[PDB]
């Protein structure tokens, strides 16, 4: 047996039926040979933005962060905790996987407080109780956890999915992979770097090699690893066939140590 | 041995803060004095219609059931499996109740097939597997179950919540209360008929004693009672003082006998 693995799924992946079919095929392949408890954590992003578009609701920001007013946390919760979550559960059912949909508040898995009065219903994640998810994992279910949470007072909160996944990893003593569009960082010679310290990450950045949104992806993993105290992997679905090895603990993307 | 009680919620209740507060206070009151575990099944009431209005989409209802187009099932799933479900989980949290949100597909609790190609993604509920919910109940959680399901082929389905709750009642061997905005059915002497057979209910419909919106509500309870072979209670959430007595087996609304 092994400690659990949290696979966090980013926006672009959820928007792509190709990526989803490759992911769930990968999950089936891995599960045929491997025993490790797996947990999925997901955001939404696109499905939320699509729905705000359709409702002609403006998506505002304060200092580079989203704002979820009282009067739209319910819509956002619908898109994320409902649509995105159940879409994943439908994929699981199609592929014969016994999944169970959760949000952060189920079993107080991840505790959430209000980040900032000015941002409204945006939550800050912290580790919660592992009891519920441990018992689901013990009984052979694959928990699929959305990044909506709830405060102890009963207020719904939209939580950054990377930070939610980090909190849940801490809660369960789990390893963490952040799956998205980046398959792995390459050095100044176009060679995948299998393992990267904070120091080489910081060098590689404004040495000019790590640029654009990749800065944000690497910084997200560094933040997660800094918190967790064990490494966090960045990977993509690109090489479907390597995902099972990735899930088994091999650094097939880029492993961040911080 | 367990004999769980399913309380089905829907309609304008889901939108009434004061009514929800009183309902959850009654749930707590029942739980403090009883070991027998509770389950909630819910529909999407005003939450779905409100989103449809804001999107300016046609609310097409053929007979009892919302025609659910392929291009609307995601949106409806969000409102029902997301917003409605997580609202109730937030109330549960406020009242210190350990609740777990589910939909019909989790643990294959209620199985769903497409009811009619013409209705689009409308599902027909049938009894499924009690394993997941029984384990949750044995471990002290309150399952809160939305009426969205999924076919074996991975297609999301919108299911009538009364029928979904009845299928779950069959699956768990549970008692069933259908809570909605109902009135008392009065006999020829102006007294509420607390308990009646299906035939009696049918007679009273034929003979114009049961009228207006109650015809629909009695027909739902009648079909449920026949399906289950146990009595099914109809009662109003507006009289929250009577709810614990109702949960304790008192026929405070209209009980349709097997
Ligand atoms: C607070 C906040 O901004 N929440 C995000 C949750 C989705 C997300 O984080 O998208 P990823 O799947 O790419 O991580 C949102 O509102 O869209
Ligand atoms: C297929 C179908 O008709 N689904 C229902 C689900 C909700 C429901 O049954 O309404 P309640 O709130 O009164 O429980 C609907 O979309 O209206």
Swiss-Prot record, chains A, B:
Cellular compartments annotated: Cytoplasm
Domain of life per record: Bacteria
Reaction catalyzed: N-acetyl-L-glutamate + ATP = N-acetyl-L-glutamyl 5-phosphate + ADP
Chief site of localization: cytoplasm
Pfam annotation, one family: AA_kinase
Result for mutant: residue 8 to R: Reduces activity 50-fold. Increases KM for N-acetyl-L-glutamate and ATP about 10-fold
Keyword RNA-binding in annotation: no
Group of enzyme by EC: transferase
Amino acids binding substrate: 44-45, 66, 158
UniProt keyword terms in alphabetical order: Amino-acid biosynthesis, Arginine biosynthesis, ATP-binding, Cytoplasm, Kinase, Nucleotide-binding, Transferase
E.C. numbers: 2.7.2.8
Subunit structure as annotated in this protein's UniProt entry: Homodimer.
PANTHER family linked: N-ACETYLGLUTAMATE SYNTHASE, N-ACETYLGLUTAMATE SYNTHASE, MITOCHONDRIAL
Name of the protein described by the UniProt record: Acetylglutamate kinase
């Amino acid at each position: 047996m092994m400690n659990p693995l949290i696979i966090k799924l980013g926006g672009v992946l959820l928007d792509s039926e190709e990526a989803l079919e490759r992911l769930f095929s990968a999950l089936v392949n891995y599960r045929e040979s491997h025993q490790r408890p797996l947990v999925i954590v997901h955001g939404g992003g696109c499905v939320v933005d699509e729905l705000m578009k359709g409702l002609n609701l403006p998506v505002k920001k304060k200092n580079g962060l989203r704002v979820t007013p009282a009067d739209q946390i319910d819509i956002i919760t619908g898109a994320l905790a409902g649509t995105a979550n159940k879409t994943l559960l439908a994929w699981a059912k199609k592929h014969q996987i016994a999944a169970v949909g959760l949000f952060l508040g189920d079993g107080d898995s991840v505790k959430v407080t209000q980040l900032d009065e000015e941002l409204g219903h945006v939550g800050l994640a912290q580790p919660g109780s592992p009891k519920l998810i441990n018992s689901l994992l013990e009984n052979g279910y694959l928990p699929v956890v959305s990044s909506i949470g709830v405060t102890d007072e009963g207020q719904l909160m939209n939580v950054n999915a990377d930070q939610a996944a980090t909190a849940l990893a801490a809660t369960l003593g789990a390893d963490l992979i952040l799956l998205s569009d980046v398959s792995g960082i390459l050095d100044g010679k176009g060679q995948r770097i299998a393992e990267m310290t904070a120091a080489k990450a910081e060098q590689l950045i404004e040495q000019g090699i790590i640029t654009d949104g990749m800065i944000v992806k690497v910084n997200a993993a560094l933040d997660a690893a800094r918190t967790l105290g064990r490494p966090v992997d960045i990977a993509s679905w690109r090489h479907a066939e390597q995902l099972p090895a990735l899930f088994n603990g091999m650094p097939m993307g880029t492993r961040i140590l911080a």
